[PDB]
Design a protein around this nucleic acid. Sequence first.
DNA 1: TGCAGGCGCGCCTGCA
DNA 2: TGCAGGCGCGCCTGCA
Lengths: 126, 125
Amino acid sequence: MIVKRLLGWKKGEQNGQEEKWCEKAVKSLVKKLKKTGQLDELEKAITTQNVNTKCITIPRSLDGRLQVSHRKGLPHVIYCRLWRWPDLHSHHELRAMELCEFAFNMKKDEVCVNPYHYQRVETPVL
Amino acid sequence: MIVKRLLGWKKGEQNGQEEKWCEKAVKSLVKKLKKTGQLDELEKAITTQNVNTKCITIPRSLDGRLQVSHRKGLPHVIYCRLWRWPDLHSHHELRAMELCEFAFNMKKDEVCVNPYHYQRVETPV
DNA sequence: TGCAGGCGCGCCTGCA
DNA sequence: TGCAGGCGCGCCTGCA
Ligand SMILES: [Zn+2]
Ligand SMILES: [Zn+2]
């Protein structure tokens, strides 16, 4: 199973309840990418950490949030936290790479959730 | 024994040598907190993971490091790694909570080693 | 520069 | 209370 394989790349140490949620977050993404034929690209990006992979997109919601098992969050934040930065606190800490065509900030009909298309930046000035 | 009970809360999977070191690190802290009457507060913070605990302090050294059984480290890093984040890289990955009065960064005469007074952050950009 | 690690005096413990 | 021996904080050297 691709879900168990992708979960093997998950960052951080989660408790029982948190583990179950992360699994639902991976299952949710896997179901979407399977329908659009982008599943192999996610496997490639996650297992190899290759920045030069294609955008991995999902439809953007009206308010930008994604709900997974009764919890809402920004999808690029969810998947960047899951596979790269477990202590990432917000989207203000993320900036998309130059080659990202569907970066969250662009506010297109599709949002790129490829964690290797984002970089961490300094928290904005007050 | 408070040492055995606090060790039961240790994070990660340690080999024989590391287990013995972790025990010395808990024994070292327990001896200091007993002398300043803070042992019950450590027990409360560790066993209940309660952020709403008092600061748990030890005297700060000239260079900030603490030596336990021939190994030196920043004491808030040592105790946060032990009870919260076993892969904690450095003090650059820890920020103290707003209510921490003796946070390591404050460089006061006393340093807070309450792991629930710190939050783990990604390495500064 | 920060930071890691070698080394010893001073403090401590456990025997006399 | 003399004395032996363990260990850490402070001082130091050297590396990234
Ligand atoms: Zn992209
Ligand atoms: Zn504190």
